[PDB]
Write a protein that binds this ligand. Structure first.
Ligand code: AV0
Ligand code: AV0
Ligand code: A1D7S
Ligand code: A1D7S
Ligand code: A1D7T
Lengths: 641, 643
């Protein structure tokens, strides 16, 4: 015998209503015969064939094919001794008709010499087009012929065909059946074929009709047809492992290269957004305008005042002397005649402030500087600059305030120096010494970059892994490759290697553009930064594993990834210090995947701390624990599935 | 006559790559007959049927159905009087059988009991389960009998069936053929059925063999059998050489398809609410638990949490180093005490503090003599009268807080020293006097700056996702083309989708505005009337961008890449999380032409300043959003015409 199904049982659904399909079978197939499995719906027999090959299991009963159990020991149905054609077209669209045969030839372990001979034979037999045409460019009928060629190409000894003749010209279906009869008659082979044209399967040596959940009858066509003296069959029915890893790796690196959309999305988007972020976010505002109502000098234009004075003693004007100390980068002076037009300009939106030096500014400032603590109230109001600022914008309102006081500090120090005096006399008692861990003029982009790097690397892996594992299982490609002999260990190993290479390339590009091209500093060790980025990428890949394990449609996976991409970015302190959140939220947010990693990377970049500091290796510990947790969850989900 | 095709020519692809499907075809179907159309591929027959019903055109030919050109002036093909069942299953999975039949009964214009009678007949005839069973729960073979009942329910004069008897038992095959023959017999009922089981097609009154884009034999089957001498139908094949009633039905279906999908409700209604809550709790607030290492050598040292800082509030300036620390802000600075200046700095070099203070052992003697000597202070008293602060300035937003809190606390210290001895506190003020701000307050919030940019981005990009996905999904499964044959114009399809989306972001705008303004106290100094109008106008601009993506994309997974490929660059160029003044001179000029750059600036002016529509900075965001609505419609209309 070849297959000895006995007392088979199966049921879909749940306890509320189990879909009772394929119950209490009795099927047997002998060597050298063309079996025929006929039915009504194209899924009561697909389940049986899937159970026979080994990609599914029966609830009760015994199953026996080609020596032993379908897929553990003795039998060879998960091996190269069975040819399988899935009901759908389980083929890759980026391959030629020659590469799509060389791939399976390497998977089945055949020498490359015989593949060409069998390729020419199958091309002659099936009159397929030129062997260099891509599969995705073929029509819907030649794909089935290519799949038939792939099924026959390795010379199996038990052919299991799932509707091979549906959209085929009858002048070719006749040849197909003749070929099956030829190879089965004398060879030590067997054929199991399911068809929808009951009358077509007249050359089968045995026909088993499937009705409800069991084989209705089992007999040769002649005896079955002559039992009732029928005229038609429809009337009766109306009563080494390294060789299989290289091929997977090559196909994985080729499928990503012939799809320009994927290459763009996962290689030119990170670079573009890194460039945009470095060019736009974090820089100091420039070009801010001011309204100057300096009444100590005559008014000529709105862009000219003739601010001239003396750089020595005698303190000529001291209102042009102060304005000379204002920074020329972030402030552009504009001149107005009276203190009402200036505030009107601020109100309408033509400026950010007003100054209004009083016409008695010098004669009162040089009196305040000399009188000291015994100064009358008159020479304390006519010796001041009155600033009406626009505080609707926080960042712009901070820079203006800071630069209107640093300029006065420089003004006072210059006054003291030009008078041959100690310049420390113009200093507040609070004395800010050299910063311990930074510079006196910090930047905001150096705070956001370690946390944009990790965000990019983490969230560009979940999508790729989820899509690659969803659009491949749902198309019947993983199941087709499994029957060829590829164990699940090799598929996972190849996928991990491919994803590792992709994330290594992404990390290289992002770190080259952030640190070398632009001015983002790195005071720590670059090797540990690379290791942390790669570990975050692996954590993202494990999250993609979980997402693809619990999801079955490619549109639900994107929703699930997007629903978790926002809160983690908003809670991990990427764009604002984590010290601002409330106490309860600050404790919850440290258990998220990206919080401690971002903190440790920021410490590495902006302080230079080694690996021994707890604030540095807590990120590594958190990332490793999250990888382990994601792997455990992914394995647990696939238990009841 | 019912259908007349002459000299039909049709091909796909470009000029370089020819894909001739039909070329010099001749067809003729009488009235009261079953045609039957047998082929090989499975796509030429579908193309011929699509050309007959009107959903596809002919490159060169002449088609005459039911009176005239199919869908131009006098042929009743694009509406009722025809029954079309597509090759696929164009059915809605959220509806039961009864709702599915009632929707198509209302589309055609039948009554509420003339649908129930047909339901009662067809359920018994086709052997279907109870009418209260959802379609998605039905098996793959029971979703085809439902389509057959939908096609046969309204009793048209021309049934066009595409592979009816597939995935069905032979008994039901014979029953269906018997019913077709019965309805056709002695009447004006015409059937055109493209079956694949060749031998079953002998019951027809004509046979339509197709090969190489033409028709070899177009004749009766009893003549086909006894003209070639063959006794078969397969072996002879082997011889080589009122618009308000239709908008209402579409609007009601649209809401029940979003209400019955719980995952869709959470993504478009419960996700914006969660984003708003987490933004107001995390982003913008000032740091609070900052720690400082304090070395006060004017007092005995006991603990790392206790120093016994005491002084006299009145006068005589007892200690003045505990007096200054008394003025430090208790909310955002925590005080920890260390015994040596060198031991406190080592605390900063680890993760234990943000600064050190180190008041000298003779701070009071030097400081009092410093302010009582004026400009005659010797260098020695300028050294022991100062506070030495070593800050950790790696963080920009914390170094600013610490620097400002340590100098503000000295203004209060000085203004209380003089003032407690009968002096004017104005003597302790720098000449630069900041009067009352014209706009805002002395303590602006960063979360008030980023707030306008979060409302606009949430609404804009949640309409791109909803419009693109709904239009791509319904078009690819034949649902949109099946409704067009029933008599629903493209005007009624677009009208019902615009209205369905309008109520979607009307609900979204209410929740985003309520939580941000009413609950979390984000100020709104302007008019709330114009904030709602501008926020809604951004939703329609986003929706019109959904039309563009769905017009040029066929697979859903490609739309996400296009939507996400433009969602990231805009947020970094529209000035949402940073002032637009930080950009370079050239990138700033380009950025203002993006959809959200000028609308965010306008909304920020109405919230944080109170400007009205009459200000140029406010209506420039209304005009820049009306222009992008027109541009997005022009781009999408050009693509459909050219493809
Ligand atoms: C870790 C390593 C994993 C392995 C490598 C990973 C890639 C492997 C999967 C590749 C993949 C997923 C990509 C999703 C990942 C990123 C999503 C992230 C989502 C972000 C939220 C990319 O899919 C490709 O994307 C192309 C973009 O270039 C796109 O082409 C479009 O834009 C082009 C641009 O101009 C434009 O030219 C082109 O005309 C457009 O069509 C097509 O959809 C497709 O070719 C899917 O592969 C696709 O599978 C298709 C069958 O479904 C297969 O179909 C073909 O053949 C069928 C015959 O069986 C036949 O029946 C189909 O009709 C036929 O079409 C495609 O050939 C194959 O490629
Ligand atoms: C202003 C415009 C007005 C338009 C209003 C109408 C819009 C409604 C569109 C509905 C839609 C688009 C979703 C768009 C996402 C929007 C965000 C964009 C993406 C983010 C960038 C929702 O899509 C559905 O979302 C469901 C979420 O609940 C999901 O359910 C999943 O998660 C659940 C939760 O955990 C979980 O409980 C549940 O178990 C899961 O199954 C469904 O599987 C998924 O298909 C697609 O509709 C779906 O279409 C399916 C066939 O295509 C159709 O399948 C049925 O039909 C066929 C036989 O009849 C046949 O195919 C199927 O055999 C049959 O089943 C579904 O019935 C129908 O629903
Ligand atoms: C927020 C608004 C901002 C700007 C608004 C607008 C500007 C213009 C207004 C309209 C113009 C354009 C909209 C976009 C269109 C463009 C038209 C053509 C695309 C037609 O797309 C066909 C198929 C899908 O085709 P398919 O599904 O197979 O259907 C068969 C049809 N042939 O796309 C795909 O696969 C692509 C999948 C994602 C591809 C990239 C994703 C992310 C990009 C990142 C790269 C950025 C770096 C730049 C690269 C240069 C450096 C080397
Ligand atoms: C950086 C982030 C990293 C980590 C974050 C944190 C912790 C990780 C622990 C992670 C473990 C799991 C999460 C998955 C959970 C659970 C399973 C569920 C779906 C399983 O799936 C079913 C199908 C798909 O099922 P289907 O495709 O039909 O296949 C048939 C199978 N039945 O999903 C769908 O429709 C869902 C489509 C999008 C639904 C929501 C999208 C956005 C959420 C926003 C709402 C937030 C507010 C909450 C609402 C409460 C207040 C009213
Ligand atoms: C239109 C397509 C989106 C469809 C759904 C849209 C629905 C509403 C959108 C946002 C809701 C508003 C909630 C936050 C959005 C705006 C408000 C804000 O505060 N935005 C900031 C933080 O979110 C801003 O984004 C900071 C970016 C800096 C880091 C950049 C790294 C980017 C990773 C690139 C690769 C990861 C790929 C992951 C999956 C590939």
């Amino acid at each position: 015998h070849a297959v000895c199904v006995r007392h088979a049982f199966k049921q879909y659904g749940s306890k509320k209503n189990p879909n009772h399909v394929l119950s209490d079978l009795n099927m047997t197939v002998a060597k050298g015969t063309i079996y025929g499995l006929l039915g009504a719906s194209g899924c009561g027999k697909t389940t049986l064939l899937s159970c026979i090959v080994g990609r599914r299991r029966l609830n009760t009963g015994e199953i026996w094919v080609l020596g032993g159990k379908p897929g553990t020991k003795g039998s060879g149905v998960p091996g190269k001794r069975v040819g399988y054609m899935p009901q759908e077209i389980a083929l890759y669209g980026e391959f030629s008709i020659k590469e799509t045969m060389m791939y399976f030839g390497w998977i089945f372990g055949m020498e490359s010499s015989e593949i060409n001979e069998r390729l020419q034979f199958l091309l002659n037999f099936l009159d397929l087009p030129s062997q260099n045409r891509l599969v995705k460019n073929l029509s819907g009928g030649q794909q089935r012929r290519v799949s038939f060629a792939v099924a026959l190409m390795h010379d199996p000894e038990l052919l299991i065909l799932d509707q091979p003749t549906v959209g085929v010209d009858p002048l070719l279906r006749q040849s197909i059946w003749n070929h099956l009869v030829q190879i089965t008659k004398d060879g030590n082979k067997t054929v199991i074929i399911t068809t929808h044209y009951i009358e077509e399967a007249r050359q089968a040596h045995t026909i088993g009709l499937m009705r409800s959940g069991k084989l209705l009858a089992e007999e040769s066509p002649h005896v079955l047809l002559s039992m009732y003296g029928c005229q038609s069959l429809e009337e009766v029915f109306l009563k080494t492992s390294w060789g299989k890893i290289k091929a997977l790796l090559q196909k994985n690196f080729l499928r990503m290269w012939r799809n320009v959309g994927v290459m763009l999305f996962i290689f030119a988007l990170p670079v573009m957004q890194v460039i945009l972020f470095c060019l736009a976010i974090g820089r100091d505002p420039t070009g801010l305008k001011l309204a100057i109502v300096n009444h100590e000098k005559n008014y000529t234009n709105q862009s000219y005042q003739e601010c001239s004075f003396d750089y020595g003693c005698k303190f000529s004007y001291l209102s042009c002397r102060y304005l000379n100390n204002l920074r020329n980068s972030t402030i552009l002076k504009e001149y107005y005649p009276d203190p009402e037009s200036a505030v009107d300009a601020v109100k309408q939106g033509h400026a950010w402030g007003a100054l209004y030096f009083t016409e008695n500014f010098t004669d009162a400032l040089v009196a305040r500087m000399a009188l000291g603590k015994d100064a009358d109230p008159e020479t304390l109001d006519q010796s001041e600059v009155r600033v009406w600022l626009d505080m609707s914008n926080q960042q712009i309102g901070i820079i203006l305030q800071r630069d209107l006081q640093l300029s006065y500090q420089d003004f006072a120090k210059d006054l003291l120096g030009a008078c041959e005096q100690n310049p420390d006399l113009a200093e507040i008692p609070i004395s800010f010494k050299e910063p311990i861990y930074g510079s006196n003029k910090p930047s905001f982009t150096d705070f956001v970059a370690p946390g944009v790097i990790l965000t990019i690397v983490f969230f560009l892996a979940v999508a790729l892994t989820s899509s690659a594992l969803i659009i491949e299982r749902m198309e019947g490609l993983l199941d087709r490759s499994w029957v060829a002999g590829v164990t699940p260990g090799e598929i996972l190993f190849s996928h991990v290697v491919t994803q590792f290479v992709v994330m290594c390339g992404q990390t290289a590009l992002v770190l080259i553009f952030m640190i070398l091209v632009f001015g983002v500093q790195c005071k720590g060790d670059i090797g540990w930064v690379i290791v942390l980025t790669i570990l975050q990428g692996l954590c993202g890949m494990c999250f993609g594993f979980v997402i693809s394990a619990i999801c079955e449609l490619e549109r639900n996976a994107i929703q699930l990834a997007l629903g978790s991409f926002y809160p983690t970015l908003l809670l991990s302190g990427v764009i604002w210090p984590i010290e601002g959140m409330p106490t309860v939220l600050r404790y919850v947010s440290t258990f998220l995947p990206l919080t401690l990693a971002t903190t440790s990377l920021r410490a590495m970049l902006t302080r230079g701390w080694s690996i021994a500091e707890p604030a540095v290796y807590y990120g590594f510990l958190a990332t490793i624990i999250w990888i382990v947790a994601f792997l455990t969850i992914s394995m647990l989900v696939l238990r009841f599935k």
